[PDB]
Design a protein around this nucleic acid. Sequence first.
RNA 1: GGUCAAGAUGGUAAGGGCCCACGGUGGAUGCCUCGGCACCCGAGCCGAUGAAGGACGUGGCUACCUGCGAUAAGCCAGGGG
RNA 2: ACCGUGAGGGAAAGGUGAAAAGAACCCCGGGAGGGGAGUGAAAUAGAGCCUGAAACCGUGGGCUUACAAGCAGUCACGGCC
RNA 3: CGAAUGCCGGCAUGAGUAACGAUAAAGAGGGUGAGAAUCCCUCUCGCCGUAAGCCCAAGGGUUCCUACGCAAUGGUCGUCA
RNA 4: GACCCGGUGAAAUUGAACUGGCCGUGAAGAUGCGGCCUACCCGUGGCAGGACGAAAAGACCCCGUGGAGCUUUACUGCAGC
RNA 5: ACCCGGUGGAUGGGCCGGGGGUGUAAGCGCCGCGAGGCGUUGAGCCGACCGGUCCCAAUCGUCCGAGGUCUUGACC
Lengths: 105, 108, 58, 46
Amino acid sequence: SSHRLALYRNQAKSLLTHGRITTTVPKAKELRGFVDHLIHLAKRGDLHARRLVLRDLQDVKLVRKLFDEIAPRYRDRQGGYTRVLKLAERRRGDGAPLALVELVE
Amino acid sequence: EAKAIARYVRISPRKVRLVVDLIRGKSLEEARNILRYTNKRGAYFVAKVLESAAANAVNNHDLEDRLYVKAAYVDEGPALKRVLPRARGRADIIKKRTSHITVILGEK
Amino acid sequence: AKHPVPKKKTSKSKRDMRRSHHALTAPNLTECPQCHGKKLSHHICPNCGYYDGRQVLA
Amino acid sequence: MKRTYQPNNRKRAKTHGFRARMKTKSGRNILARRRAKGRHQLTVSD
RNA sequence: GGUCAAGAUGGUAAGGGCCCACGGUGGAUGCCUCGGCACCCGAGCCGAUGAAGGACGUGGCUACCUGCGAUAAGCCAGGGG
RNA sequence: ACCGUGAGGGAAAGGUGAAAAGAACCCCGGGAGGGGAGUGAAAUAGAGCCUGAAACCGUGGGCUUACAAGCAGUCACGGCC
RNA sequence: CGAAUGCCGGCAUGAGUAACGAUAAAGAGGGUGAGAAUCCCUCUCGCCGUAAGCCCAAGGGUUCCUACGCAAUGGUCGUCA
RNA sequence: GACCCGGUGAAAUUGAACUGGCCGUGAAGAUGCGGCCUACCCGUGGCAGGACGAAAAGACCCCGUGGAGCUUUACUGCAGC
RNA sequence: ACCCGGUGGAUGGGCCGGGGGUGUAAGCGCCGCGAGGCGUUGAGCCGACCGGUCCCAAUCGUCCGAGGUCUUGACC
């Protein structure tokens, strides 16, 4: 829980910074679901949406950044603002199938 | 024909064995890719073994690509006698078990 | 507190069978997209970067 | 869990020790005992 | 030649049991010795002229082993050489 | 060496070679370790390196394995090698 | 000499099941490496905070820095100690 | 946590083992003796019943003209009075 | 292991429409020194439930897998 969020948090964040990232299979897939809907509000655009997405990622630089920055680029589609793509390698000791995901561009 | 062998290897006789059992009586290249993207440890170690084997092979035992593995086997050896907690009384060791790595490279 | 710990040695033989059911199977792999080499079915590689998109390096 | 080994310099040295050992009959005694009997060093030396 | 009814034998082994070949592992073994052990002869006190026993010490270049100790692997004098 | 506070207890570890001539150089490798080349009487004598057997783990083969009891087996007969 | 719950020493068992030593969490980015979940910088975040504070001493005693380097110790790694 | 993944990778008990139910039987509460009935080859997540399961050469017992503590008008003595 | 999907797709998530859940939001706005109140609002925000649409991601590839045993007889 506290954690599920936590993650969705740091990740959603750095993610917007980069447009893509490396996590593991699932990690990616849901980071997708949500960073995604965040994106959707980014679209919504306004006092309110802004409010929410910040409500979670917490910080202007990016908040608006996403919002005014790319929201545009995407304002048009129907979700899918994210594209998760399976990776070819596994983190050691471990054996875990990491993946790379991005905002579709 | 020529081969690949390394003692004082620090690894799972067994697991090691599955590694080889699988890249097995098969194509050099091919199995090579096998150690390449295959999981678990050793994979590496083994692929190394191969490398040295075929190098050894056309360099001074000689027709590169017609080579494959003609047999492969690992043999456990000197142990690593590990001293762990006393029976909160009498020590209890566990032996890392050094492993012997051997593989055959032979042309077609 | 070892209520039950094996009662008999285990039979070399059988023991091994037990182990037996256990089988190794090299990753299915498929040849590249065009970076021409063999690859982990479905993925870019230190050969590739493609798929349909140039994401990767070297 | 106050074992027993806590080494108190002051003390250990004190309660045992060359001098001490000489001090008494027994002491000196087993002192030579070892001396010859096996080499080694001696208490306080430790 | 094809169909159907019936009948009996076999090939396919994940691991496996026994048989062999070739390594590994483990150090038994035989033999070997600069070491004991055991009887017999020789020998039989050391000590403040701080002994027996260690302490910290030199080696050009360093733990350890040694031998000295401050004139530290050594100083003198006589016999061997 | 080591458990003991202490008094005290008290291991295990010898052998390569005739003598190192102990392994330049080349070869894969992060390396160790593996391959060549040279010693060589041999290095499956190669540095914990004589003789290094058993237990036990491996790798190839013969035979043998899915309506079947038993450690074992052993008497008969058959198939395959 | 099976044969004395034998002594010595190897060597297999369960078994690749059991455990990783406090449910105070992590994640991303780049850096270095032969190779890094397990090292370095860096940005999200969590946990102390009467302590998971710094201090005096007791005890240990070079463990400290700095350049090197990883075979074993480090209950995985490990270019980190 | 367990379970699947990758890294790591012990332990007591243990003659040996390819080890069914039966009704009976034997030393008298049998997987392996008899007659019979099901019964294919392997495994992992599990459930405890049996393998008189493990742990400990019964501490409740009795036996050895066994031991150690204490008791009184038990024997004998020593102490001190 | 079982079952249905594998871009000639709706399978998963996204979006979207719906319910169903909370109970009228963030803002300005007006009444009271304040506290707040009422309005804009039954709003706002919404986890699985029903069902759209190819926004995103099931690409592309590989393996293995039959041939029809021997003899009797009944038929064409």
